[PDB]
Ligand binder design. Structure first.
Ligand SMILES: CCCCCNC(=O)[C@H](Cc1ccc(N(C(=O)C(=O)O)c2ccccc2C(=O)O)c2ccccc12)NC(C)=O
Length: 282
């Protein structure tokens, strides 16, 4: 079970140790492309790179690099593109990826500024009348409308391929209340955010993978993907409590390094799942 496992681990101050076990067991693959000198300025952090085998390739012939990894969960039959918060010079690449991968939704789990520094570039327009044009990738982005709520904001955006004049609707799911330090006391708001994403169909098969990101695209992004996949898995199994979240994180890490960066995010993940399951069945 995972319910009791939480018990055993929690009332034993074992989280820190469990997390370390994962780190030690986690997969390790080459990130050659990410380390090429010409891509140095396409990476926010020198210690956070995508494995070559699962990296997303931009369809351009100049440089197909972008710091983004395709996490492909076979059993749960769900795919996610985890990426770093874009940089002032990679916003065009970012939206090019959304277009090419036919993504329907973009999930943001951080704020543009946190701790007095920029953790992500302002990659989307804040005003309907002030659209954005990414000349390098020939794309136009317009803010159609947004619904601001207590712990998160949902925006309707229009992305247009200026080259073909084709347009699409992208939904921006911005969790705006992640705490300055640690993790949310309760996963309730986080769960509602997730369900809201699910409801839109952004995580469904008839669309490309959702694009998920925070700053490095491994920590908060990891809790989101881990929670979703675990919840979905419990829906497909005869024995829901057989789902081993640690096993799921380890599988996920085969596609992108460092998913879930602290014992806290790991614990929060268990919480989100455990609670999410109860809510779904009442
Ligand atoms: C993959 C190995 C990670 C090695 C550690 N590296 C780091 O922490 C950082 C990159 C880096 C990685 C992960 C982060 N991070 C993330 O959730 C994330 O943006 O992925 C967090 C890590 C620990 C605790 C909290 C958070 C959080 O934001 O809630 C970061 C959050 C803010 C700023 C940077 C971050 N590297 C450098 C050079 O500063």
């Amino acid at each position: 079970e995972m319910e009791k496992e939480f018990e055993q681990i929690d009332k034993s101050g074992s989280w820190a140790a469990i997390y370390q076990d994962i780190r030690h067991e986690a997969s390790d693959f080459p990130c050659r492309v990410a380390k090429l000198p010409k891509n140095k300025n396409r990476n926010r952090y020198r210690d956070v790179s995508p494995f070559d085998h699962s990296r997303i390739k931009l369809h351009q012939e100049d440089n197909d690099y972008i710091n983004a990894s395709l996490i492909k969960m076979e059993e749960a039959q769900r795919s996610y593109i985890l990426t770093q918060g874009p940089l002032p010079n990679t916003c065009g690449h970012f939206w090019e990826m959304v277009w090419e991968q036919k993504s329907r939704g973009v999930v943001m789990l951080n704020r543009v500024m946190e701790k007095g520094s920029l953790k992500c570039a302002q990659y989307w327009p804040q005003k309907e009348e002030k659209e954005m044009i990414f000349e390098d990738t020939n794309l136009k982005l317009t803010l159609i409308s947004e619904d601001i709520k207590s712990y998160y904001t949902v925006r309707q955006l229009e992305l247009e391929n200026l080259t073909t004049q084709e347009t699409r609707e992208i939904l921006h799911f911005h969790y705006t209340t992640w705490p300055d330090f640690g993790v949310p006391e309760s996963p309730a708001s986080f769960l509602n955010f997730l369900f809201k994403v699910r409801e839109s169909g952004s995580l469904s098969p008839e669309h490309g993978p959702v694009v998920v990101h925070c700053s490095a695209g491994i920590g908060r992004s990891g809790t989101f993907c881990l929670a979703d996949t675990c919840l979905l898995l419990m829906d497909k199994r005869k024995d829901p409590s057989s789902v081993d979240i640690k096993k799921v994180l380890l599988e996920m890490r085969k596609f992108r390094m460092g998913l879930i960066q602290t014992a806290d995010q790991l614990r929060f993940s268990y919480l989100a799942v455990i609670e999410g399951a109860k809510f779904i069945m009442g």
